[PDB]
Design a protein around this ligand. Sequence first.
Ligand code: E5E
Length: 378
Amino acid sequence: SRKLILFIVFLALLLDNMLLTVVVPIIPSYLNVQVGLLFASKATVQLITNPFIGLLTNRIGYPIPIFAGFCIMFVSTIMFAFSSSYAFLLIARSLQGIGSSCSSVAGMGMLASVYTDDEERGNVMGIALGGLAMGVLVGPPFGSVLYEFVGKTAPFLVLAALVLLDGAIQLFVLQPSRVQPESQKGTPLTTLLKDPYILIAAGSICFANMGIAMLEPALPIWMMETMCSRKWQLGVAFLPASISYLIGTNIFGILAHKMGRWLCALLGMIIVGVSILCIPFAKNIYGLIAPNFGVGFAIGMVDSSMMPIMGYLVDLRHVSVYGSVYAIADVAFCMGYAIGPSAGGAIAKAIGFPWLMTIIGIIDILFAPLCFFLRSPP
Ligand SMILES: [NH3+]C[C@H](O)c1ccc(O)c(O)c1
């Protein structure tokens, strides 16, 4: 009965993303450079602290970092509930970033260590990546209704209660009582970063995520400038991408092994490039549904095909320890999540938004054929 571990990782991934999207629309109203710093602090701190957790998991194990992630996330949720100042907001966001890094790295490492089968690893990481998608979709309406009806602190109090329940479950099953070092060495990061295949996988993930990371804040400004759409059109414009990410992840986590992980990644990169290229031609929302659906489905195909390939490469060419490589993958995600909005806005101000989308699409299409080198020798 190792499904209890999968349940814990899924719930943890769902709750940070639920808190991530709830805070986004609430703080700016009550609160250029400082706002951008507040937005990017979580990603920057997580990117900085990924390697330290990756190294620590080889020394003390997974349960102590996983339990620490719940304690930091509970503290951050309480501080978000009660604090009302800028410095406290920065501290809460930094703590949220640290907790998210711990949770993601430790959970992915434990999932890779427990489900040693190649196909089952992808099967379970499909559901694990599903939890992030569910949190992004469920969070905004939850936060909006609780803020409208009960009060400002009600969504954060409910999230704190859910985190407390998750921590009670973790204490019941994980039982982080002692410190247990791992058996073998860790294959230091300098040797892993010299592998061209790991670099190719990380670059594919980084570019695929940077596409949507730059697209998501830039599109609303263009929609107001060109189509003069109302408030709710901006909100419901990115719903197809959110649904498509969930559907594509849950399907391709199982479907990628039969077709081939390299082929799935190549097709995903081509599809996302074509969709981003076709986005600027839209004239209204009906012209924007299909491109957004395609972008989300393609990002779901790339992620669910490139996590188990990282695990497989580490198993094949180095020692079977996964904390460091999954810290590398989390760093690849945070690279897109950190400098995305600011650079995207700067480019969309220097040149046109369609030019930015064209550049992103061309870059993705040109990087697509590099995934051919990831195919297995036999
Ligand atoms: N890693 C998840 C991926 O970057 C992502 C996140 C939010 C989304 O709405 C999405 O379509 C994809």
